Design a protein around this ligand. Structure first.
Ligand SMILES: *[C@@H]1O[C@H](CO)[C@@H](O[C@@H]2O[C@H](CO)[C@@H](O[C@@H]3O[C@H](CO[C@H]4O[C@H](CO[C@H]5O[C@H](CO)[C@@H](O)[C@H](O)[C@@H]5O)[C@@H](O)[C@H](O)[C@@H]4O[C@H]4O[C@H](CO)[C@@H](O)[C@H](O)[C@@H]4O)[C@@H](O)[C@H](O[C@H]4O[C@H](CO)[C@@H](O)[C@H](O)[C@@H]4O)[C@@H]3O)[C@H](O)[C@H]2NC(C)=O)[C@H](O)[C@H]1NC(C)=O
Ligand SMILES: *[C@@H]1O[C@H](CO)[C@@H](O[C@@H]2O[C@H](CO)[C@@H](O[C@@H]3O[C@H](CO[C@H]4O[C@H](CO)[C@@H](O)[C@H](O)[C@@H]4O)[C@@H](O)[C@H](O[C@H]4O[C@H](CO)[C@@H](O)[C@H](O)[C@@H]4O)[C@@H]3O)[C@H](O)[C@H]2NC(C)=O)[C@H](O)[C@H]1NC(C)=O
Ligand SMILES: *[C@@H]1O[C@H](CO)[C@@H](O[C@@H]2O[C@H](CO)[C@@H](O[C@@H]3O[C@H](CO[C@H]4O[C@H](CO)[C@@H](O)[C@H](O)[C@@H]4O)[C@@H](O)[C@H](O[C@H]4O[C@H](CO)[C@@H](O)[C@H](O)[C@@H]4O)[C@@H]3O)[C@H](O)[C@H]2NC(C)=O)[C@H](O)[C@H]1NC(C)=O
Ligand SMILES: *[C@@H]1O[C@H](CO)[C@@H](O[C@@H]2O[C@H](CO)[C@@H](O[C@@H]3O[C@H](CO)[C@@H](O)[C@H](O[C@H]4O[C@H](CO)[C@@H](O)[C@H](O)[C@@H]4O)[C@@H]3O)[C@H](O)[C@H]2NC(C)=O)[C@H](O)[C@H]1NC(C)=O
Ligand SMILES: *[C@@H]1O[C@H](CO)[C@@H](O[C@@H]2O[C@H](CO)[C@@H](O[C@@H]3O[C@H](CO)[C@@H](O)[C@H](O)[C@@H]3O)[C@H](O)[C@H]2NC(C)=O)[C@H](O)[C@H]1NC(C)=O
Ligand SMILES: *[C@@H]1O[C@H](CO)[C@@H](O[C@@H]2O[C@H](CO)[C@@H](O[C@@H]3O[C@H](CO)[C@@H](O)[C@H](O)[C@@H]3O)[C@H](O)[C@H]2NC(C)=O)[C@H](O)[C@H]1NC(C)=O
Ligand SMILES: *[C@@H]1O[C@H](CO)[C@@H](O[C@@H]2O[C@H](CO)[C@@H](O[C@@H]3O[C@H](CO)[C@@H](O)[C@H](O)[C@@H]3O)[C@H](O)[C@H]2NC(C)=O)[C@H](O)[C@H]1NC(C)=O
Ligand SMILES: *[C@@H]1O[C@H](CO)[C@@H](O[C@@H]2O[C@H](CO)[C@@H](O[C@@H]3O[C@H](CO)[C@@H](O)[C@H](O)[C@@H]3O)[C@H](O)[C@H]2NC(C)=O)[C@H](O)[C@H]1NC(C)=O
Ligand SMILES: *[C@@H]1O[C@H](CO)[C@@H](O[C@@H]2O[C@H](CO)[C@@H](O)[C@H](O)[C@H]2NC(C)=O)[C@H](O)[C@H]1NC(C)=O
Ligand SMILES: *[C@@H]1O[C@H](CO)[C@@H](O)[C@H](O)[C@H]1NC(C)=O
Ligand SMILES: *[C@@H]1O[C@H](CO)[C@@H](O)[C@H](O)[C@H]1NC(C)=O
Ligand SMILES: *[C@@H]1O[C@H](CO)[C@@H](O)[C@H](O)[C@H]1NC(C)=O
Ligand SMILES: *[C@@H]1O[C@H](CO)[C@@H](O)[C@H](O)[C@H]1NC(C)=O
Ligand SMILES: *[C@@H]1O[C@H](CO)[C@@H](O)[C@H](O)[C@H]1NC(C)=O
Ligand SMILES: *[C@@H]1O[C@H](CO)[C@@H](O)[C@H](O)[C@H]1NC(C)=O
Ligand SMILES: *[C@@H]1O[C@H](CO)[C@@H](O)[C@H](O)[C@H]1NC(C)=O
Ligand SMILES: *[C@@H]1O[C@H](CO)[C@@H](O)[C@H](O)[C@H]1NC(C)=O
Lengths: 455, 211, 231, 213, 240, 136
């Protein structure tokens, strides 16, 4: 009938706190070992067997928008990039001016890949050579003999990424340190921020690929049953809408130009790689998306958009308010960075939920660059070395990024704009289900147990 | 500029390379032209031939890029010998106006034919017009390389001699004619006039005398 | 099933407007394409220009300056006109019925297809000369039979004296005799005129009562001459 | 019910009172727990005792439990006016539902007397229009229990159309009751007055209405 | 510290079926059993059964094992330790003796020896099984009567007459008048119909500053009666 | 009820269950409280600082359990009475109607005070008397 405190070691008590998570990537061992930037294997390999522990009777509130795991992953990508550019060639003496000719092509009724000629001091400092190269139009801007320079030379320095490192995304796992654990939602239709009914705990998150992208998302996690429209504030137009797909739609992008790789000696031991003379037919890089599969995927997105919205509802408009890098769906495949015109992709008009004889494969043209300032990162730019041969790749699209028009003070129904407001939202699209907590294994409690008297 | 020569054995198949090779996907036309006659195309699409063309001719389709557009001629005979043009239409080059460089096909080891020389004295009505011309006609000789030498008595003429360059006829043999302009008094002066036609190592001579 | 017939002067003074006509009998002009190809001696064929079925011209950039091509709707004939001709413009003129193909090496919507033409039907071809010199009509001298070879084979013919207009047509008995005929090519004499000969090989049995007459027509001189040949 | 309690019991103010709860050995107390509930009629009950002696959360220490091998008891100490109600025990195991008892009504003695409030209403004029006439005699705020009601027509008893309700407890721990006399307008108009007589064991109160006024 | 709110009172004919709901709030609905207990005049309080919202398991008394169908919904989360839920109870083959009051009750403990013991109880659902049809009441005004001449108090109210379904509801001034209200229980006439009275005690001087309106709602008949009590009284003691 | 070595409830296996339920299996959150036991890049300093943080937090608990007379034991009883000002619930209400979570959220106010009372009133007093009693 008397109560005495009794301390316990190992109590199931956790608290929400922030820790410095680390990476987990399975072992890739090969003779032709090519190091990877986005997920270096310096981080500990994942366990051979994943261990997930279900937490019955737990109701925990998740908020993907306040999650500190996103802010850390976004900071891990930035610092992982710069460590691969430091030991590679920087194109500082290549800011010399260029006299450029348009590519040879018959005008059916202009040219963007272009051609240029410039000087290059050899490995020896006094000698001077003169060679030619082929630089896409977006990478060079004129100064007045139609003289030219690189787009970045008056802005900042530029470094050429080594050809050894690969620009492909491999699944990454985020493990929390000992004494902590990660809580994972499992509700089939889990609203963005709220309570998750049946939760579980895991030490390392599932295989997340770090795919840098804009507008529509690629190679993500597909939610089951009906699709979901996660938003921090569906009533505020300034808040980004994240969308999720249930069925996987496939995208097919190729660069048909069979280019070549010319090694130029701009300095001692520094080989600047550039595009050689084109071989074969002149062509532009396109992307194909089956409209029969995009039509159904679009018809389901408006339904979930008609649920968050009134019964009288209409459809969207596209891509106005930023730089041409924001306008186009930017990503990477094979090594070249595409920038696709997504006008035909959102073309439709639905009412209470385009051409009947329209062509089978939707096809968009994608302008390619080679000088990039990604994640809005001003300063040292990166030069993507040209890829030998023909480029062909196919990805799965798993998510979109929209944005409301923003009516001034009144609404003529409603329109939506595809917009990548921030690069971090590409991580919220996969870190919505995870959350980090610390374990407090100290628990005082009363029982009718008094320790032995002092004797 | 000028014509490219090509020599092939009789009956053996042959191939004809095409100048200014394409830089991308191409649709080449092959035209068979004989001097003075109408040109006939054998292959409008690199693998397609119109109705009437025999199956001996064929062209190289461009299934995979890098193939060279050649014109194959199986069973090379007398009739295949002509000038061949290769029209080019690639995707990299603009409007291709000109035709390809001509290709002079010559069929080898074709049997030689002895020439048929025919000498004609000047007509009586031509003499009334105070002129006289000797007509020496050569026909049905294959090796187109005859040298015509004239002889007045035992003396070469060497003057007023006009001779055609050999031209092929319908029999695929060549044909040449030599003309010797004279004055009616010089024609009446000499005993006889001779036309010597040297063909290969051989030589044929015809002689005509005034009445 | 399509026949083309070229007609023209065959002789034009320098620095004047050449004209020609291409008569079609197979089908309508508004269904296929037409073009003109000339043949100059010592040089390869040359494509000068073409006309579409909806009447749209397109000329070779080297002749682009002086060439105009038209087609008549009432008459199935296409006319050619060349201004400021020289004696290099002298050639055998071919009109041909061209038709169009479409070569696509990629997607049709983003261009990536080039049009190529080919002329499947050709005309006989007309000859045109350019020279400041005047027209010279030919005179006909008969070549009497030598009375020649054993077995009865003998030879006669007709001589055509010097003329400058190069094209010359020769027939026999108004085209009644075709065996043994062999019209030889004309020779360009130092006089500046051409001269040809036409022989016919016939048996000696019929060499007496043959009544062989050669018919020498000529167009630039506008003269038709018939000559009797007898031993 | 096979679980029998004492039909009634009484205790004085500020004193204690004990209630019993016993039955056959099929509903024995040795191998089953006993829980007590305070169940005022017309309202939701409240758990005061669960798993025998241990009391529910919030229950004052005045309540206490005890269970013998043959019966169980519930002792209410320091009686209050609100403790004057009905009580049930319950027999249950962990996986077998509850078996309620017969019931026990507790009466607290040593009480203060409350004077009865009597009010009599005549039938409204709108009611007399439709040929109906009903007298309403309302009684309220009497601490002494069990009231008796009597009706009279011109100082003479009535027996046709008399309906009297059972006594009901007021929110202020007092009691209330009502009675109705259904009549015809001829009986209503042919009499000089009607009376509702409320009789208690200590004093009798009478209220009279007259159809003339 | 949660509230249990049950469905309203219903009137069904014998032989039919009825389904009662019990919406919860203020606690983890998955952590406690939901007991169903009824109370009739012939058998007293009778326990019917309980059901588990987390496991779906149910125990019914054999007296109700063949006629009670209990179901639960899925809890709707509110916070981390509270939620809202709903429990259902379906009874078929109704008889006249089944007429009484039905309760749903929250369990006691999550673990232990009395995990299902009914602890928190709802307000109870009144079920009447009769072959007669619904009858609406007739409301009459009760003229003011004197309560204390020296104290200056009076009493007025409204009368309810001849309504068949038992539930009765009376309010004053749309709920703005709650002090001094005293509602009396109903009477069971020999015809089967019910009737009761409601009276409120107010000062006698409050006649030109306060409006008195009795609002009678009889939801089984879907009838609302708003009667204005005439403040002019016939009592000679109150006229003084 | 009771699992005889095959319960595999796992790390935080019963955080939604009652306090008395989860208290029976507290070696699962004990071994797995220091699971990190089983090159200048970012993953090097992020891992080396994650290892040293884990070892530093583990040594905080064993530090407190050392100045409490509990170093070896997972469960250990005390001698300081439970003031009802901390919580006023019954031993049937705490260990059968509450999970460690909501329970710790109720006594979190007073923990730092109890952590003091625990080490001064006991173990510090015990060792002083354990020195005096064994003197004779
Ligand atoms: C999350 O939180 C919830 C709280 O809602 C937890 O649920 C609670 O679990 C505890 C522990 O298990 C329960 O305490 C026990 O409750 C027992 C009563 O229910 C069990 O057994 C009965 C027996 O069923 C038969 O008999 C019935 C007679 O009433 C009859 O109705 C039925 O049809 C059967 O014929 C089952 O009815 C009941 O469902 C349950 O377990 C059974 O069913 C489940 C699911 O269907 C199944 O998986 C099981 O295998 C089993 O078949 C009670 O008997 C028991 O007391 C006895 O054991 C305890 C051990 O602690 C001992 O202390 C005691 O002395 C007895 O020996 C104990 O009281 C509690 O009732 C549950 N509460 C609710 C509201 O569900 C849940 O566990 C938790 N989850 C996690 C992951 O932590
Ligand atoms: C999808 O995700 C959204 C989040 O983006 C969830 O939104 C919930 O919306 C409700 C709306 O009622 C919010 O409730 C609001 O809570 C405010 C304060 O929060 C405290 O109290 C709430 C009690 O509900 C606690 O949950 C919370 O932890 C805090 O302790 C109140 O101040 C609000 O009331 C005020 O405004 C309203 C009008 O808007 C007035 O009527 C009030 O008088 C007062 O002025 C309001 O009650 C809730 O906080 C949001 N989050 C939840 C519930 O987790 C959606 O619910 C979610 N949907 C689904 C299906 O998951
Ligand atoms: C939203 O954006 C999308 C993406 O572009 C548009 O979809 C395209 O719409 C265009 C028309 O705007 C479509 O192009 C049309 O193609 C037809 C071809 O189909 C015929 O021929 C093919 C073979 O080539 C057959 O297989 C088929 O059975 C048909 O027989 C053309 O007939 C159309 O011609 C029209 O335009 C041309 C050129 O301008 C004119 O010369 C014609 O006179 C005529 O006006 C047309 O070219 C295209 O197919 C659609 N894409 C796909 C993937 O199918 C939506 O139209 C657009 N919606 C808007 C803007 O409201
Ligand atoms: C894209 O552009 C690239 C150019 O960068 C181009 O690759 C080139 O392909 C040609 C083939 O047409 C290669 O030429 C080869 O050279 C090698 C040198 O060792 C030879 O061995 C090859 O012949 C061999 O294989 C034959 C196959 O049947 C054999 O039969 C033969 O006996 C030999 O074993 C051949 O001559 C050229 O080297 C490459 N250039 C490179 C790789 O830089 C490619 O074809 C283009 N593709 C498209 C689709 O446009
Ligand atoms: C509660 O959340 C859990 C957490 O994931 C969900 O459980 C998952 O349910 C799926 C059902 O298709 C299980 O998939 C299958 O599991 C079996 C058993 O391991 C396996 O043999 C199959 O290959 C497949 O993986 C999945 O295991 C399970 N996840 C876990 C971690 O147990 C569940 O859907 C949610 N709903 C409920 C009602 O609990
Ligand atoms: C993107 O879409 C593609 C559609 O092709 C999905 O490909 C699927 O990938 C899985 C895993 O590799 C395939 O399963 C495996 O197939 C191989 C080959 O037959 C077999 O040997 C293995 O045992 C296994 O079954 C699956 O077949 C394949 N789909 C199809 C239609 O073939 C891919 O999963 C999608 N990715 C994302 C992220 O959505
Ligand atoms: C994007 O590219 C993918 C893959 O390159 C295309 O997927 C292909 O789609 C067809 C659709 O029928 C598949 O055909 C299949 O053929 C097999 C064998 O006969 C048959 O059993 C199946 O039922 C089906 O008919 C094809 O396998 C599939 N994948 C590949 C590798 O070919 C897709 O069409 C493209 N989408 C675009 C361009 O929009
Ligand atoms: C969605 O597509 C529509 C297509 O019409 C876009 O509407 C156009 O919006 C521009 C905005 O600048 C209008 O330009 C106008 O410029 C004048 C200059 O004085 C100014 O006074 C107007 O207030 C306006 O800004 C343009 O007129 C309008 N189109 C037409 C036909 O009038 C719309 O902007 C697109 N929305 C998005 C988010 O892309
Ligand atoms: C890009 O420009 C350079 C410079 O004009 C071109 O280089 C010349 O190409 C021609 C072939 O047409 C060669 O004969 C010359 O020898 C090249 N010059 C030098 C200095 O090497 C180059 O061809 C152009 N590339 C393209 C695709 O047009
Ligand atoms: C340097 O390049 C420019 C054009 O880019 C050229 O005019 C100049 O002659 C070059 N100087 C050298 C090769 O020394
Ligand atoms: C969303 O924005 C609206 C308008 O600014 C504001 O009233 C509302 O509180 C916001 N809600 C959230 C959850 O941000
Ligand atoms: C649909 O929305 C329109 C808005 O104009 C409105 O008139 C109508 O009543 C709505 N109908 C429904 C069922 O919401
Ligand atoms: C659009 O939808 C609304 C509401 O469903 C309807 O009233 C209106 O007629 C529709 N208009 C068109 C053009 O479809
Ligand atoms: C797309 O779907 C809508 C609705 O199902 C339909 O009306 C339309 O014809 C479809 N278009 C195509 C190209 O499949
Ligand atoms: C419990 O704490 C309160 C508040 O500090 C104090 O007044 C009381 O004396 C304490 N009682 C015991 C037994 O420690
Ligand atoms: C604490 O316990 C006392 C003794 O029963 C009681 O009077 C008081 O209300 C309780 N307070 C709380 C908050 O439980
Ligand atoms: C202690 O907890 C109580 C109950 O939640 C709260 O009222 C009080 O403010 C807390 N005190 C402190 C110092 O946090």
């Amino acid at each position: 009938a008397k109560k005495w405190v009794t301390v316990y070691y190992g109590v199931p008590v956790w608290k929400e706190a922030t820790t410095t998570l680390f990476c987990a990537s399975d072992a890739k061992a090969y003779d032709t070992e090519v190091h990877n930037v986005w997920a270096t294997h310096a981080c500990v390999p994942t366990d051979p067997n994943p261990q997930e522990i279900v937490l019955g009777n737990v109701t925990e509130n998740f908020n993907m928008w306040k999650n500190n795991m996103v802010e850390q992953m976004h900071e891990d990508i930035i610092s992982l990039w710069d460590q691969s550019l430091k030991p590679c060639v920087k194109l500082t003496p290549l800011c010399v001016t260029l006299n450029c000719n348009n590519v040879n092509t018959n005008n059916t009724n202009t040219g963007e890949m272009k051609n240029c000629s410039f000087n290059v001091t050899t490995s020896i400092r006094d000698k001077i050579k003169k060679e030619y190269a082929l630089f896409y139009k977006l990478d060079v801007v004129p100064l007045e003999i139609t003289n030219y320079r690189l787009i970045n030379c008056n802005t900042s320095v530029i470094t050429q990424a080594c050809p050894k490192v690969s620009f492909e995304p491999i699944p990454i796992h985020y493990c929390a340190p000992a004494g902590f654990a990660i809580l994972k939602c499992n509700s089939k239709t889990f609203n963005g921020s709220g309570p998750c009914t049946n939760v579980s705990t895991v030490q390392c998150t599932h295989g997340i690929r770090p795919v840098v992208s804009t507008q529509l998302l690629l190679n993500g996690s597909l939610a089951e049953e009906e699709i979901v429209i996660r938003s921090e504030n569906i009533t505020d137009n300034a808040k980004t809408i994240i969308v999720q797909l249930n069925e996987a739609v496939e995208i097919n992008c190729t660069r048909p130009n069979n280019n070549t790789r010319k090694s130029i000696h701009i300095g001692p031991g520094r080989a600047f790689y550039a595009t050689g003379d084109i071989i074969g037919n002149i062509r532009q890089a396109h992307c194909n998306i089956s409209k029969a599969r995009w039509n159904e995927t679009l018809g389901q997105i408006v339904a979930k958009l008609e649920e968050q919205f009134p019964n009288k509802t209409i459809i969207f408009n596209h891509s106005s308010g930023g730089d041409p890098e924001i306008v186009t769906h930017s990503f990477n495949c094979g090594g070249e960075f595409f920038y696709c015109n997504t006008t035909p992709l959102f073309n439709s008009t639905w009412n209470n939920t385009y051409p009947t004889g329209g062509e089978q494969n939707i096809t968009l043209q994608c302008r390619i660059k080679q000088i990039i300032n990604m994640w809005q990162g001003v300063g040292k730019a990166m030069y993507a070395p040209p890829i030998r041969g023909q480029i062909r790749c196919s990805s799965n699209i798993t998510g979109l990024l929209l944005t409301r028009d923003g009516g001034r003070d009144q609404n003529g129904t409603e329109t939506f704009r595809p917009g990548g407001g921030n690069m971090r939202d590409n991580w919220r699209s996969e870190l919505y289900k995870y959350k980090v907590v610390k374990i407090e294994p100290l628990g005082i409690a009363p029982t009718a147990c008094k320790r032995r008297v002092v004797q | 500029s000028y014509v490219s020569p090509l020599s092939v054995a009789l009956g053996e198949t042959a191939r004809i390379s095409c100048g200014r090779q394409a830089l991308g996907s191409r649709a080449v036309q092959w035209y068979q032209h004989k001097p003075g006659q109408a040109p006939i195309l054998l292959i409008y699409n690199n693998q397609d031939r119109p109705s009437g063309i025999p199956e001996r001719f064929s062209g190289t389709p461009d299934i995979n890029f890098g193939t060279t557009a050649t014109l194959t001629i199986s069973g090379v005979e007398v009739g295949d010998e002509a000038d061949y043009y290769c029209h080019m239409w690639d995707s990299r080059s603009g409007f291709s106006w000109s035709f390809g460089g001509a290709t002079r096909l010559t069929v080898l080891s074709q049997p030689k034919a002895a020439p048929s020389v025919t000498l004609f004295p000047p007509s009586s009505e031509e003499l009334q017009a105070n002129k006289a011309t000797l007509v020496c006609l050569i026909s049905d000789f294959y090796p187109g390389a005859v040298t015509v030498a004239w002889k007045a008595d035992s003396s070469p003429v060497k003057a007023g001699v006009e001779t055609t360059t050999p031209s092929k006829q319908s029999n695929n043999k060549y044909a040449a004619s030599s003309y010797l302009s004279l004055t009616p008094e010089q024609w009446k002066s000499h005993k006889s006039y001779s036309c010597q036609v040297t063909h290969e190592g051989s030589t044929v001579e015809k002689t005509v005398a005034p009445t | 099933q399509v026949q083309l017939q070229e007609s023209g002067p065959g002789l034009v003074r320098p620095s004047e407007t050449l004209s020609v006509t291409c008569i079609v009998s197979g089908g309508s002009i508004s269904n296929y394409y037409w073009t003109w190809i000339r043949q100059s001696p010592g040089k390869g064929l040359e494509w000068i220009g073409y006309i579409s079925d909806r009447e749209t011209t397109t000329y070779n950039p080297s002749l682009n300056s002086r060439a105009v091509i038209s087609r008549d709707t009432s008459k199935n004939q296409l006319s050619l006109q060349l201004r400021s001709v020289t004696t290099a413009d002298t050639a055998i003129y071919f009109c041909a019925t061209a038709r169009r193909g479409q070569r696509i090496y990629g997607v049709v919507s983003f261009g990536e297809f080039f049009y190529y033409y080919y002329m499947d039907v050709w005309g006989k071809g007309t000859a045109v000369t350019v020279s400041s010199a005047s027209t010279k009509g030919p005179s006909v001298f008969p070549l009497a039979p030598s009375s020649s070879t054993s077995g009865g084979t003998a030879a006669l013919g007709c001589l055509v004296k010097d003329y400058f207009p190069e094209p010359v047509t020769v027939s026999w008995n108004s085209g009644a005799l075709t065996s043994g005929v062999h019209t030889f090519p004309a020779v360009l004499q130092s006089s500046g005129l051409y001269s040809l000969s036409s022989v016919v090989t016939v048996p000696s049995s019929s060499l007496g009562t043959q009544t062989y007459i050669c018919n020498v027509n000529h167009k630039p001189s506008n003269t038709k001459v018939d000559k009797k040949v007898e031993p | 019910s096979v679980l029998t309690q004492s039909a009634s019991v009484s205790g004085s103010l500020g004193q204690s009172v004990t209630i019993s709860c016993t039955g056959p050995n099929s509903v024995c107390c040795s191998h089953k727990s006993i829980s007590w509930y305070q169940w005022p009629p017309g309202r939701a009950p409240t758990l005061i005792i669960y798993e025998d002696n241990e009391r529910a959360p919030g229950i004052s220490p005045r309540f206490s439990g005890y269970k013998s091998y043959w019966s169980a008891y519930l002792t209410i100490s320091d009686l209050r006016p609100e403790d004057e109600t009905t009580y049930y025990c319950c027999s249950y195991t962990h996986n077998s539902g509850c078996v309620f008892g017969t019931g026990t009504k507790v009466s607290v003695l040593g009480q203060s007397k409350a004077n009865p409030s009597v009010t009599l209403f005549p039938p409204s004029s709108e009611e007399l229009q439709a040929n109906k006439a009903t007298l309403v005699c309302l009684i309220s705020d009497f601490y002494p229990g069990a009231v008796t009601v009597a009706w009279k027509a011109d100082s003479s008893p009535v027996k046709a159309g008399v309906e009297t309700t059972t006594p009901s407890k007021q929110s202020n721990n007092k009691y209330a009751a009502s009675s109705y006399l259904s009549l015809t307008p001829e009986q209503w108009k042919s009499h000089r007055s009607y009376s509702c007589q409320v009789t208690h064991e200590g004093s009798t109160v009478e209220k009279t209405v007259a159809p003339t006024e | 510290e949660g509230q249990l709110v049950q469905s309203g009172a219903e009137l069904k004919k014998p032989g039919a079926s009825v389904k009662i709901s019990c919406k919860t709030s203020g606690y983890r609905f998955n952590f406690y059993h939901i007991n169903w207990i009824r109370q009739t005049a012939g058998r007293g309080p009778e326990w019917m059964g309980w059901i588990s919202p987390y496991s779906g398991d149910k125990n019914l008394a054999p007296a109700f094992q063949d006629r009670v169908i209990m179901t639960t919904d899925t809890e709707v989360p509110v916070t981390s330790f509270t939620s809202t839920g709903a429990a259902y109870m379906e009874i078929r083959n109704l008889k006249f003796d089944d007429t009484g009051t039905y309760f749903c009750a929250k369990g006691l403990l999550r673990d232990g020896s009395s995990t299902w013991l009914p602890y928190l109880w709802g307000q109870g659902t009144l079920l009447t099984v009769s072959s007669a049809s619904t009858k609406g009441p007739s409301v009459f005004p009760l003229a003011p009567s004197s309560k204390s001449t020296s104290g200056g108090t009076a009493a007025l109210g409204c009368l309810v007459k001849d309504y068949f379904p038992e539930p009765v509801t009376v309010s004053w001034n749309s709920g703005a008048l709650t002090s001094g209200v005293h509602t009396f229980p109903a009477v069971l006439q020999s015809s089967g119909l019910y009737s009761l009275s409601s009276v409120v005690t107010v000062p006698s001087s409050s006649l030109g500053t306060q409006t008195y309106i009795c609002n009678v709602n009889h939801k089984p008949s879907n009838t609302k009666v708003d009667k204005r009590v005439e403040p002019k009284s016939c009592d000679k003691g109150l006229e003084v | 009820a009771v699992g005889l070595g095959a319960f595999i409830l796992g790390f935080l296996g019963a955080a939604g269950s009652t306090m008395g339920a989860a208290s029976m299996a507290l070696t699962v959150q004990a071994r797995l409280l220091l699971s990190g036991i089983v090159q200048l890049t970012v993953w090097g300093i992020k891992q080396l600082q994650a290892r040293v943080l884990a070892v530093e937090r583990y040594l905080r608990d064993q530090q407190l359990l050392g100045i409490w007379g509990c170093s070896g034991k997972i469960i250990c009883c005390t001698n300081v009475p439970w003031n009802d000002s901390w919580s006023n619930k019954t031993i049937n209400e705490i260990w059968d109607n509450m999970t460690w979570m909501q329970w710790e959220k109720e006594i979190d106010n007073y923990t730092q005070h109890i952590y003091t009372l625990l080490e001064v009133s006991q173990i510090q007093q015990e060792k002083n008397e354990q020195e005096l009693l064994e003197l004779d």
